[PDB]
Ligand binder design. Structure first.
Ligand SMILES: [Zn+2]
Ligand SMILES: [Zn+2]
Lengths: 138, 137
């Protein structure tokens, strides 16, 4: 439930966690929503949820535990935790209450329909995800 | 968020929602846990969780809504009377608190590691799934 989404031969990861090579091969990139889609050699079978679920379960890494959360629908939110990014509005942000700290970014938030998003930032009982439900042919 | 679990080149479905063709072709069947596994032509969509999670999110079809659950872990449980499977014990049961009515069978219960089980029964404030995390080798 960590790393990123492996939908076939394309990897979805946070913009702030991508490598130089991934940036060189990237097909979709969004600094505002902190997302990057690039072709990779590690083929996978993850699926993107083409749904409207507002409830899900996400993997927290510094606890190695899965936490269910009801989260607020995707929208523009003011975020200053990821000091990689300065205090700014991010787009496609899902906010919820739950454990999250440095290094948890990239963990999977999923619902029965598939992957909803990727953990972006978190601190002090608040966890944030980037909503990927409109990526790779929404 | 309903119907089978399509993994690799197999479909994993409820025993009582299985068709004749897939019952005859199945490489695995277990009536006591309500499970059937058969090769499927369709390409993979899902992954089987190989975890010890006691928490997940399941899809209730009669409300078209996902709900989060904490379940006790696989075990043997008494299942009350049902249309296809009358009152009896069922094996590899996960039990949780949530809505459930007739026809909700086949809903997916999932976690970040993949699909954990399928809804098999439910009434009052209790819902019960079949654990599929043991279909290895
Ligand atoms: Zn969903
Ligand atoms: Zn799990």
């Amino acid at each position: 439930g960590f790393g990123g989404v492996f939908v076939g031969s394309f990897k979805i990861i946070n913009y702030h966690l991508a490598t130089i090579e991934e940036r060189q091969s990237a097909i979709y990139v969004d600094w505002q929503s902190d997302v990057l889609v690039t072709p990779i050699a590690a083929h996978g079978r993850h699926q993107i949820a083409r749904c409207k679920c507002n409830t899900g379960v996400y993997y927290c890494r510094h606890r190695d535990k899965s936490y269910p959360v009801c989260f607020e629908g995707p929208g523009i939110q003011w975020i200053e935790q990821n000091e990689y990014y300065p205090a700014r509005y991010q787009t496609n942000v899902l906010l919820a209450a739950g454990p999250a700290e440095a290094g948890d970014a990239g963990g999977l938030l999923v619902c029965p329909h598939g992957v909803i998003g990727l953990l972006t930032a978190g601190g002090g009982g608040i966890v944030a995800f980037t909503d990927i439900r409109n990526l790779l042919w929404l």
